[PDB]
Amino acid sequence: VQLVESGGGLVQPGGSLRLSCAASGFNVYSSSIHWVRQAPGKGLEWVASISSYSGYTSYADSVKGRFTISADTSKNTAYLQMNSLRAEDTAVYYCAREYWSWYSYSYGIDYWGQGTLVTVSSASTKGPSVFPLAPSSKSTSGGTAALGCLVKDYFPEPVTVSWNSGALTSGVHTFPAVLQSSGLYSLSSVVTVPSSSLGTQTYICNVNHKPSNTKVDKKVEPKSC
Amino acid sequence: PEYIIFVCAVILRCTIGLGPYSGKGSPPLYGDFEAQRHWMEITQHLPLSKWYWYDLQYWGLDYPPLTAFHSYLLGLIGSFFNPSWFALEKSRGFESPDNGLKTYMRSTVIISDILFYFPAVIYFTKWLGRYRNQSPIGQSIAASAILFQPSLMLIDHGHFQYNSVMLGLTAYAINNLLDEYYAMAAVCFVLSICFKQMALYYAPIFFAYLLSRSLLFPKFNIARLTVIAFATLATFAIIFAPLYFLGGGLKNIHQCIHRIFPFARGIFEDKVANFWCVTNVFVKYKERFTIQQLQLYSLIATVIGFLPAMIMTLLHPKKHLLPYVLIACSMSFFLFSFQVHEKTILIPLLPITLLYSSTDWNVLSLVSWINNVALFTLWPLLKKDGLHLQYAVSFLLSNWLIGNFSLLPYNVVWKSFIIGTYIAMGFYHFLDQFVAPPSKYPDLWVLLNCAVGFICFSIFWLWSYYKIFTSGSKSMKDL
Amino acid sequence: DIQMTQSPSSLSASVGDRVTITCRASQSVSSAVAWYQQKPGKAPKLLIYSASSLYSGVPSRFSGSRSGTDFTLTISSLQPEDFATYYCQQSYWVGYPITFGQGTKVEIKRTVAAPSVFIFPPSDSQLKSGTASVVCLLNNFYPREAKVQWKVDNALQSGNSQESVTEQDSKDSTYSLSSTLTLSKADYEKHKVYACEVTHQGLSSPVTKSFNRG
Ligand SMILES: CC(C)CCC[C@@H](C)[C@H]1CC[C@H]2[C@@H]3CC=C4C[C@@H](OC(=O)CCC(=O)O)CC[C@]4(C)[C@H]3CC[C@]12C
Ligand SMILES: CC(C)CCC[C@@H](C)[C@H]1CC[C@H]2[C@@H]3CC=C4C[C@@H](OC(=O)CCC(=O)O)CC[C@]4(C)[C@H]3CC[C@]12C
Ligand SMILES: CC(C)CCC[C@@H](C)[C@H]1CC[C@H]2[C@@H]3CC=C4C[C@@H](OC(=O)CCC(=O)O)CC[C@]4(C)[C@H]3CC[C@]12C
């Protein structure tokens, strides 16, 4: 028994999308499907329902008059149609089946789908820029020296990052990429080292963007004036 | 001689059907005329594997197969006359200036009733009379009183329901039980259940009767038990086989079972003469309990209200306790059910009206009174469909030919309560027409209506529970 | 019209403690309250249903309960595979909408520590672009609740700076955090001194890293 989502990706604000949820191992004509989105950095939210024993639908006021949910009962599939697609809709959409029974006894949302990502935005697929967050020339001698690389202005997520060509992850902090002002994204990578092996050791943070074909390397070094 | 009543009744049912049906002038979703027209349009244009799946949000199919077959037959006989009536998705909401398609349907209901309801009741009263040597006029009056029952004559001809069929099949079952053809009474009841599933309000009695008669009362007759268990199963299978073979398989059986018995949504959201419309205005169950708990307590409450009668039959089955145990069971289902509606008092009214052939005068007075109360609790429904003139004309004629204008049980505590119920009726048709609600309790007369009927129903219910035990004492069968 | 108020949003516990999460509904009209668990990034998993009945395959240490409208989830022995987010969920009937709580992130506890604070001026190769970004980095601190303030020449800089974090470490359970104040080349060439003041329970007197524009 397993559900599978399909259909979702970069759509300009105002377009439309058809999300499909294929069921396998149970009949959807008796399971009262639900759709549920999780926005990036938020809590699980509910969007739309379908009962399938009487076809009673129901929506979240956020998405009323813009979403239309249905179920192909013969081939055991569920469909969601998004029409206006405001910008506050980027999320991970799950299709979940909840089985009710006589006398109002439900059994919870026991089968979830692995979710599909909707990015209701507008930004030509761009490649990153890499500025080295150098180590301060006054880093604590014999203490710690934290440095890294700031990768800015890139789109669609995600981005693969590495140090010393993947061979040096001994204390590497890669902070979740933020959605900066311009609608693009950006993030940074930091790594700590002992102040003894600062001037002699050399590190080059490597960045890889598969959805724009851009791969770069930036050697971080002590900026001395 | 005695065939002019059977004709005046049909003329009455014809003239009551010149008033507006349920839903005239209502674009979005019409009433119950449009549901039936839609079924007649949908059954003859789709395969048998889409009747219960086709369009569940615009008057889907809510009744078991026999209703579908009935609608199919009538749809053929009617798409003969004019085809543009029952077209697929085109003739949706069909209203004609000529009043064509408003006569064909009003005549299909008359025909189905003449077939499935008149002979049953007439043969019942004939059997009773001939068994008790009732003067032919004694039978004819008891048979005229049963055919002019206002509640059914207005809920069928004027609101457009096919209830006369579901009740006539059950009257056939009761007749078979009288004549002692149990193997055929089982089948007639299994048919009555497959037209409208609201006939299951008698199963707790039919089951006990057939069982105690087969394996307990006379002997441990094991052949009759097999004959009955095979009649039931053969009829169920022959009625549900078209869905299986010609349908889709078990998927069709499951979809039909869950369309017939739907899940409940809401909590006491309709104004009925229930035990809950009347106490939900003090206890506010919505703020104390959950819906699971209420759906459990209503079941316990209805099962505890029909157990005493079920067991009295299953332990002492006879042919003079049938009407009372049927009342005791069906009224119990009506009072304490989680979801009851304004109608569904026709189910408790079939056995009640059957008691219009009794010999006493207390019985006939209680019967007439409860018929008036049952009609009265339907004014809110028959007032939003028009039907102000037909309501009054039937309310007057039924009482007139009975003798209620020329009359109450015998006591000081019965006559007073009955006259008080009448006085509190005649004061709702005066606070409803002239004086406007308090404007701070918008529907205050509708609640007085839900409430002044519950008292009468729950006193008649206990009177029947009294008749079951005080009678049934080697009692006549002539009383 | 149908909501669930989960309490709270964050609470620390050690391996072995007993934990209890509450969730109260604006009205007790259905005991169909299910409790789901979610790890970071995966799909939720049904733990409890009917507000008291345990799922199949779920450990024995999960027990739900209801008292009027104050449903509760109890973990009688928090094992290392029990730190995640936990949601209630209430549904009235079939044709009606449902609602999820806000989420109760349970995390591991440790000793209150004091984080490191660094500040990097904008990169040379970036000022050639037209925008600069001063970075203020807090490292290895607990709990997550911290305070970062930006001051460029003694002002209450607010609006043009964004701060992000990580999730709790797996080897010592210490957070990291990085704030960045971005300035168009003009604003940057308008000031000289750039500093950030870090306030953490572990730091008695708020630390303040700084530098001059050069
Ligand atoms: C002598 C013979 C002809 C009597 C026939 C008996 C059956 C037709 C009865 C016996 C037990 C009944 C059942 C008892 C249990 C249920 C659950 C019940 O569920 C509800 O009431 C819906 C309430 C909700 O979930 O909101 C619906 C009726 C049903 C299927 C009954 C179906 C019909 C049944 C099988
Ligand atoms: C008013 C009359 C029509 C009531 C008829 C009563 C019985 C004929 C009903 C009551 C409970 C029903 C059953 C309840 C559920 C099942 C399981 C069902 O199979 C499945 O659940 C899965 C089928 C699928 O989805 O593929 C097949 C129908 C069945 C046997 C139902 C058969 C018919 C039953 C016995
Ligand atoms: C040995 C077997 C055949 C049991 C014999 C007794 C049953 C025939 C009785 C006991 C449980 C009853 C049922 C219990 C509840 C239902 C659902 C009812 O529709 C409702 O949803 C209202 C139920 C309520 O009161 O809450 C219709 C009658 C029915 C099938 C009852 C009809 C008769 C039933 C099946």
Q: Whose CA is nearest to atom 5 of ligand 1?
A: B203
- Note whether A29 contacts B56, CB cutoff 8 Å: no
R_g (Cα) of chain C, nearest Å:
23
Calpha distance B9→B16 (Å, rounded): 11
As to burial, measured by CB atoms within 10 angstroms (0-12 exposed, 13-18 middle, 19+ buried), residue C87 is: buried
A-chain CB neighbours of B56 within 8 Å are 54-55
Q: Is the CB of B168 under 6 A from ligand 3?
A: no
Of A57, A87, A120, the residue that ends a domain is A120
Structural domain including A58 reads 4-120
What does the H/E/C string look like for chain B? CCCCHHHHHHHHHHHHHHCCCCCCCCCCCCCHHHHHHHHHHHHCCCCCCCCCCCCCCCCCCCCCHHHHHHHHHHHHHHHHHCCCCCCCCCCCCCCCCCCCCCCHHHHHHHHHHHHHCHHHHHHHHHHHHHHHCCCHHHHHHHHHHHHCCHHHHHHHCCCCCCHHHHHHHHHHHHHHHHHCCHHHHHHHHHHHHCCCHHHCCCHHHHHHHHHHHHHHCCCCCHHHHHHHHHHHHHHHHHHHHHHHCCCCCHHHHHHHHHHHCCCCCCCCCCCCCCCCCCCCCCCCHHHCCCHHHHHHHHHHHHHHHHHHHHHHHHCCCCCCCHHHHHHHHHHHHHHHCCCCCCCCCHHHHHHHHHHHHCCCCHHHHHHHHHHHHHHHCCHHHHHCCCCHHHHHHHHHHHHHHHCCCCCCCCCHHHHHHHHHHHHHHCCHHHHCCCCCCCCCCCCCHHHHHHHHHHHHHHHHHHHHHHHHHHCCCCCCCCC
- Compute CA distances B146 → B173, B348, B351, B367, B401, whole Å: 17, 14, 11, 11, 12
Q: Is the CB of B261 under 6 A from ligand 1?
A: yes
In the numeric block, the tokens 């490597």 are attached to A206
B-chain CB neighbours of A29 within 8 Å are 251, 255
Calpha distance B322→C46 (Å, rounded): 52
Q: Could you tell which of B67, B192, B235, B250 is best to mutate to test the pocket of ligand 2, judged by most ligand atoms within 8 Å of the CB?
A: B250
Helix, strand, or coil (residue A164) = coil
B-chain CB neighbours of C49 within 8 Å are none
- A82 touches A119 (CB < 8 A): no
- Note whether C124 contacts A223, CB cutoff 8 Å: yes
What is the structure's resolution, reported in angstroms to one decimal? 3.0
- Compute CA distances A22 → A5, A17, A26, A33, C30, whole Å: 7, 16, 11, 11, 30
Number of domains into which chain A is organized: 2
The helix (run of H) or strand (run of E) holding residue A207 is strand A203-209
Q: Is C199 on the interface with A (CB under 8 A)?
A: no
Q: Which two tokens stand for residue B435?
A: 């004086």
Question: Which residues make Cβ contacts (< 8 Å) with residue C55, sequence separation at least 6?
Answer: A108, A110, C46, C47, C48, C49
Calpha distance B191→A157 (Å, rounded): 64
Q: Is the CB of B64 under 6 A from ligand 2?
A: yes
Q: Is the CB of B258 under 6 A from ligand 2?
A: no
Q: Which of A152, A129, A132, A121 is nearest to A214 (CA)?
A: A129
- Give the ligand with the smallest distance to the CA of B253: 2
- C138 touches C111 (CB < 8 A): no
- Compute CA distances B209 → A24, B140, B197, B438, whole Å: 47, 29, 20, 52
Domains with residue ranges and CATH for chain C: 4-106 (2.60.40.10), 116-212 (2.60.40.10)
Phi, psi dihedrals of residue B186, rounded to the nearest 5°: -55, -40
Q: Is the CB of A27 under 6 A from ligand 2?
A: yes
Which of C120, C165, C214 comes nearest A175 by C-beta? C165
- Note whether A190 contacts C43, CB cutoff 8 Å: no
Question: Which residues make Cβ contacts (< 8 Å) with residue A209, sequence separation at least 6?
Answer: A127, A128, A154, A159, A160, A215
Residues A13 and A95 in one domain: yes
Helix, strand, or coil (residue A78) = strand
Q: Whose CA is nearest to atom 1 of ligand 1?
A: B207
Q: Is C103 on the interface with A (CB under 8 A)?
A: yes
Residues A112 and A214 in one domain: no
Which of C97, C126, C133 comes nearest A46 by C-beta? C97
Residues A138 and A216 in one domain: yes
- Note whether B251 contacts A104, CB cutoff 8 Å: no
- Give the ligand with the smallest distance to the CA of A52: 2
Residues A59 and A133 in one domain: no
Q: Is the CB of B337 under 6 A from ligand 3?
A: yes
Calpha distance B261→B254 (Å, rounded): 11
How far does the centroid of ligand 2 lie from the alpha carbon of residue B191, in Å?
17
- B199 touches B247 (CB < 8 A): no
Disruptive mutation site among B258, B288, B291, B296 for chain C (greatest number of C CBs within 10 Å):
B291
Atom of ligand 1 nearest to the CA of B232: 3
Of A120, A137, A169, the residue that ends a domain is A120
What does the H/E/C string look like for B119-154? HHHHHHHHHHHHHHCCCHHHHHHHHHHHHCCHHHHH
- C78 touches C60 (CB < 8 A): no
- A32 touches A58 (CB < 8 A): no
What does the H/E/C string look like for chain C? CCCEEEECCEEEECCCCCEEEEEEECCCCCCCECEEEECCCCCCEEEEECCCEECCCCCCCEEEECCCCEEEEEECCCCHHHCCEEECEEECCCCCCEEECCCCEEEECCCCECCEEEEECCCHHHHCCCEEEEEEEEEEEECCCCEEEEEECCCCECCCEEEEECCCCCCCCCEEEEEEEEEEHHHHHHCCEEEEEEECCCCCCCEEEEEECC
b/e sequence A187-214, b meaning 16+ C-beta within 10 Å? bbbbbbbeeeebeeeebbbbbebeeeeb
As to burial, measured by CB atoms within 10 angstroms (0-12 exposed, 13-18 middle, 19+ buried), residue B433 is: exposed
As to burial, measured by CB atoms within 10 angstroms (0-12 exposed, 13-18 middle, 19+ buried), residue B371 is: buried
Cα-Cα end-to-end distance for chain C: 58
Distance in Å, alpha carbon of A130 to nearest chain C alpha carbon: 9
Using a CB–CB cut-off of 8 Å, the residues of B that contact A are 53, 56-57, 60, 251, 254-255, 258-259, 262-264, 291-292, 295-296, 299
Q: Which of A81, A70, A78, A73 is nearest to A97 (CA)?
A: A78
How far does the centroid of ligand 1 lie from the alpha carbon of residue B299, in Å?
12
Q: Is C174 on the interface with A (CB under 8 A)?
A: no
- Torsion of Cα atoms, B190 then B196 then B197 then B203, to 10°: -40
Residues A113 and A137 in one domain: no
Q: Could you tell which of B298, B304, B333, B338 is best to mutate to test the pocket of ligand 3, judged by most ligand atoms within 8 Å of the CB?
A: B333
b/e sequence A118-151, b meaning 16+ C-beta within 10 Å? bbbbebeebebbbbbbbbbeebeeeebbbbbbbb
Q: Which two tokens stand for residue B69?
A: 């077959």
Residues A141 and A178 in one domain: yes
Please count the residue pairs, one from chain B and one from chain C, whose beta carbons lie less than 8 angstroms apart.
Answer: 24
Calpha distance C64→C35 (Å, rounded): 8
- Give the ligand with the smallest distance to the CA of B263: 1
Which of A43, A98, A152 comes nearest C100 by C-beta? A43
Q: Which of B328, B309, B358, B338 is nearest to B457 (CA)?
A: B328
Q: Which chains touch B (3 or more CB pairs under 8 A)?
A: A, C
Residues A59 and A149 in one domain: no
Nearest residue on chain B to C31, alpha-carbon basis: B290
- Torsion of Cα atoms, B40 then B44 then B46 then B47, to 10°: 120
How far does the centroid of ligand 3 lie from the alpha carbon of residue B201, in Å?
8
Nearest residue on chain C to B288, alpha-carbon basis: C28
Q: Which of B225, B230, B182 is nearest to B206 (CA)?
A: B182
Atom of ligand 3 nearest to the CA of B333: 25
Q: Which two tokens stand for residue B440?
A: 């701070």
In the numeric block, the tokens 């006359």 are attached to B81
Calpha distance C176→B369 (Å, rounded): 83
The domain spanning residue A51 has which CATH number? Answer: 2.60.40.10
Calpha distance B373→B331 (Å, rounded): 14
> Count of CB atoms within 10 A of residue C84's CB?
18
- Note whether B263 contacts C93, CB cutoff 8 Å: yes
Q: Which of B419, B409, B422, B330 is nearest to B376 (CA)?
A: B422
- A221 touches A160 (CB < 8 A): no
Which of B265, B287, B290 comes nearest C96 by C-beta? B265
Q: Can you give the residue ranges of every domain in chain B?
A: 273-479
- A24 touches A92 (CB < 8 A): no
Return the residues preceding each gap in chain B, C–N over 2.5 A, or none.
406
- Note whether B287 contacts C27, CB cutoff 8 Å: yes
Q: Please give the single-letter amino acid code of residue B446.
A: V
> Count of CB atoms within 10 A of residue A218's CB?
22
R_g (Cα) of chain A, nearest Å:
24
Question: Which residues make Cβ contacts (< 8 Å) with residue C127, sequence separation at least 6?
Answer: C185, C188
> Count of CB atoms within 10 A of residue B479's CB?
11
As to burial, measured by CB atoms within 10 angstroms (0-12 exposed, 13-18 middle, 19+ buried), residue B440 is: exposed
Disruptive mutation site among A28, A30, A52, A53 for chain B (greatest number of B CBs within 10 Å):
A53
Which of C31, C94, C95 comes nearest B292 by C-beta? C31
Cis before C143? omega within 30: yes
Q: Which two tokens stand for residue B478?
A: 């002539």
| Residue A20 within a domain | yes
Calpha distance B60→B51 (Å, rounded): 8
- Note whether C31 contacts B267, CB cutoff 8 Å: no
Disruptive mutation site among B57, B265, B297 for chain C (greatest number of C CBs within 10 Å):
B265
Residues A88 and A159 in one domain: no
Of A120, A152, A184, the residue that ends a domain is A120
| Residue A225 within a domain | no
Q: Which of B207, B454, B206, B468 is nearest to B342 (CA)?
A: B454
Cis before A158? omega within 30: yes
As to burial, measured by CB atoms within 10 angstroms (0-12 exposed, 13-18 middle, 19+ buried), residue C91 is: buried
Phi, psi dihedrals of residue A114, rounded to the nearest 5°: -65, 0
Calpha distance C77→C71 (Å, rounded): 19
- B16 touches B7 (CB < 8 A): no
Calpha distance B164→B169 (Å, rounded): 9
Q: Is C212 on the interface with A (CB under 8 A)?
A: no
Which of B263, B287, B292 comes nearest C30 by C-beta? B292
